[PDB]
Write a protein that holds these residues in place. Structure first.
Motif, PDB file in Angstrom:
ATOM      1  N   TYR A   5       0.825  -1.194   0.000  1.00  0.00           N
ATOM      2  CA  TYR A   5       0.000   0.000   0.000  1.00  0.00           C
ATOM      3  C   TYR A   5       0.868   1.256   0.000  1.00  0.00           C
ATOM      4  CZ  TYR A   5      -3.126   3.699   1.149  1.00  0.00           C
ATOM      5  OH  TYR A   5      -3.777   4.906   1.163  1.00  0.00           O
ATOM      6  N   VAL A  22      -7.931  -4.492  -0.994  1.00  0.00           N
ATOM      7  CA  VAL A  22      -7.137  -4.033   0.137  1.00  0.00           C
ATOM      8  C   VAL A  22      -6.998  -5.214   1.089  1.00  0.00           C
ATOM      9  CG1 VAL A  22      -7.140  -2.519   2.162  1.00  0.00           C
ATOM     10  CG2 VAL A  22      -7.741  -1.615  -0.108  1.00  0.00           C
ATOM     11  N   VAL A  24      -5.286  -6.328   4.483  1.00  0.00           N
ATOM     12  CA  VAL A  24      -4.640  -5.847   5.702  1.00  0.00           C
ATOM     13  C   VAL A  24      -4.024  -7.021   6.446  1.00  0.00           C
ATOM     14  CG1 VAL A  24      -4.908  -4.653   7.882  1.00  0.00           C
ATOM     15  CG2 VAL A  24      -6.238  -3.918   5.859  1.00  0.00           C
ATOM     16  N   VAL A  56      -1.657  -3.810   3.089  1.00  0.00           N
ATOM     17  CA  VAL A  56      -1.608  -2.794   4.129  1.00  0.00           C
ATOM     18  C   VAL A  56      -1.056  -3.446   5.386  1.00  0.00           C
ATOM     19  CG1 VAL A  56      -2.928  -1.102   5.479  1.00  0.00           C
ATOM     20  CG2 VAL A  56      -3.589  -1.615   3.103  1.00  0.00           C
ATOM     21  N   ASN A  57       0.082  -2.943   5.863  1.00  0.00           N
ATOM     22  CA  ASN A  57       0.689  -3.482   7.068  1.00  0.00           C
ATOM     23  C   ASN A  57      -0.027  -2.875   8.273  1.00  0.00           C
ATOM     24  OD1 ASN A  57       2.342  -3.941   9.376  1.00  0.00           O
ATOM     25  ND2 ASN A  57       4.121  -4.322   8.048  1.00  0.00           N
ATOM     26  N   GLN A  61       1.073   1.268   8.958  1.00  0.00           N
ATOM     27  CA  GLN A  61       0.351   2.196   8.091  1.00  0.00           C
ATOM     28  C   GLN A  61      -0.977   2.573   8.747  1.00  0.00           C
ATOM     29  OE1 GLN A  61       1.198  -0.620   4.463  1.00  0.00           O
ATOM     30  NE2 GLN A  61       1.693   1.439   3.672  1.00  0.00           N
ATOM     31  N   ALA A  64      -3.656   4.547   6.810  1.00  0.00           N
ATOM     32  CA  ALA A  64      -4.422   3.700   5.901  1.00  0.00           C
ATOM     33  C   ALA A  64      -5.561   2.992   6.629  1.00  0.00           C
ATOM     34  CB  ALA A  64      -3.488   2.685   5.223  1.00  0.00           C
TER      35      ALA A  64
END
Length: 103
Positions: A5, A22, A24, A56-57, A61, A64
């Motif tokens: 991301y 997305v 995560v 997405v970490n 992040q 985000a």
């Protein structure tokens, strides 16, 4: 495609017309690991050929997460044409994950 991301790559994907996933994740999550296993071959299948996946970490992040209204690792959010279609938390059934991407 699968990429980390970033603001700029995500916004460009959303404006492109392509579906966007997305994903995560967290580096110390057995569920996340398990998901990743099963999702990786699904991402290469022809039905997924236009899908743009962003990892997405959860740990690093945080801006985000607020944008995506995400409170847990192992959350998947599917967008089509820039709008959220559905989301899922913790799912590890291969057939359910396939259907999440496909339907």
């Amino acid at each position: 495609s699968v990429e980390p991301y970033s603001d700029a790559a995500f916004t460009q994907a959303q404006a492109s017309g392509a579906p966007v996933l997305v994903d995560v994740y967290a580096d110390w999550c057995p569920v996340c690991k398990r998901q990743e296993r099963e999702l990786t071959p699904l991402f290469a299948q022809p039905a997924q050929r236009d899908l743009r996946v962003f990892k997405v970490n959860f740990d690093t992040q945080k801006a985000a997460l607020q944008q995506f209204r995400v409170s847990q690792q192992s959350t998947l959010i599917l967008y089509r044409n820039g709008q959220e279609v559905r989301r899922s938390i913790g799912e590890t059934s291969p057939s359910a994950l396939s259907d999440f991407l496909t339907r």
